[PDB]
Every structure is written in structure tokens, then in C-alpha cells.
Amino acid sequence: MDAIKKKMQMLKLDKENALDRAEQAEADKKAAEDRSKQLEDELVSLQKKLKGTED
Amino acid sequence: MDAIKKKMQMLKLDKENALDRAEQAEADKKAAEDRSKQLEDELVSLQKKLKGTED
Amino acid sequence: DFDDIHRKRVEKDLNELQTLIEAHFENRKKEEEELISLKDRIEKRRAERAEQQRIRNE
Numbered sequence: 001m002d003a004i005k006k007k008m009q010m011l012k013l014d015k016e017n018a019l020d021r022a023e024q025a026e027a028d029k030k031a032a033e034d035r036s037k038q039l040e041d042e043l044v045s046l047q048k049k050l051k052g053t054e055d
Numbered sequence: 056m057d058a059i060k061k062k063m064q065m066l067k068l069d070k071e072n073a074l075d076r077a078e079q080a081e082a083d084k085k086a087a088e089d090r091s092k093q094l095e096d097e098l099v100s101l102q103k104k105l106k107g108t109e110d
Numbered sequence: 111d112f113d114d115i116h117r118k119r120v121e122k123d124l125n126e127l128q129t130l131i132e133a134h135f136e137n138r139k140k141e142e143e144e145l146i147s148l149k150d151r152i153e154k155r156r157a158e159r160a161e162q163q164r165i166r167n168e
Contacts, residue, residue, distance in 0.1 A: 001131055001134070001135075002134050003130055003131015003134075004127075006126065006131070007063075007131075008062070008063075008066075009120065009127070010120040010121060010123055011063060011067065011070075011124075013117070013123075015066055015070055015073075017113045017117065022072075022073040022076040026077075028080065028081070029081075029083050029087070032084045032088055032091070033087045042098065043094055043098045043101065046098060046101050046105065047101065053108050
């Protein structure tokens with residue numbers, strides 16, 4: 001009819017916005033966790049270098 | 056009718072799924088970010104003690 | 111954000127659309143009432159034509 005189509009369009013705009021936000025948040029999590037794990041690896045290498053210096 | 060109900064329910068389900076997924080991702084992002092901050096703070100002190108050891 | 115204004119926009123879109131939906135609902139409903147009254151006076155016409163035709167035939 002008439003109002004039904006508009007209501008469907010609203011329900012679809014919510015769909016697109018929610019899905020896009022979810023995808024963006026997932027990409028953010030991937031990037032942040034990669035950052036953290038690379039920092040942890042750098043910390044490990046520093047520990048090993050400290051061990052060599054102690055030797 | 057029949058089509059309106061199923062389509063509307065499926066679209067609302069899609070919106071809710073995307074929202075909850077985004078919230079989970081952002082929570083993990085915040086936790087990883089704070090842990091990364093902890094890693095930075097500990098790494099600086101590790102570098103300082105390494106520098107003293109080298110001196 | 112842009113998502114906020116987009117949400118408000120699709121929101122007012124849904125509002126105006128459901129408004130016009132109920133509106134044409136009411137309009138076509140009035141038209142159906144008029145058509146029902148038309149059918150009723152039509153059956154009145156059928157009955158009156160039947161009785162006068164039957165009188166003529168008698």
C-alpha cells in the first residue's frame with residue numbers, strides 16, 4: 001500500500017546502519033588486538049635482550 | 056496478512072543481531088586497548104631497568 | 111552522528127508514510143462505505159423494480 005512501504009524503508013535504514021556499525025566495530029577490534037599483540041611481542045624481545053645483557 | 060509479519064520480524068532480528076555484535080566487538084576493543092596501555096607502561100619501565108643494567 | 115540524523119530522517123519518513131497509510135485507509139474506507147450504501151440502495155432498486163414488474167405482470 002502506502003504507509004507499509006515507508007515503514008519497511010525505515011526498518012531497512014535501521015538494518016543498514018546497524019550492520020555497518022557492527023562491521024566497523026569488528027574491524028576496530030581486529031586492528032586493536034593486532035596492535036596489542038605486536039606490543040606484547042616487542043615486550044618479549046625486550047625481556048630477552050635484557051636477559052642477554054644480564055648474562 | 057502473512058508477508059508483512061515475517062519480513063518485519065526478520066528485519067528487526069537483523070538489526071538486533073548487528074547491534075549486539077557491535078557491542079561485543081566494542082567491549083573487546085576497550086579491554087584490548089586497556090591491556091595494550093598496560094603493556095606500554097610496563098615496557099617503558101623494562102627499558103629503564105635495561106638501560107641501568109647496561110650502564 | 112550521521113547515523114543519528116539518518117535515523118531521525120528514516121524515522122520521520124516512517125511517520126509520514128504510516129500517516130498517509132492510515133489516511134488512504136480512511137479515504138478508501140469512506141469510499142467503501144459509500145459503495146456499500148450504493149449496494150444497499152441498489153438492492154432497494156432491485157426490490158422495487160421486482161415488485162412493480164410483478165404488479166405489471168399480474
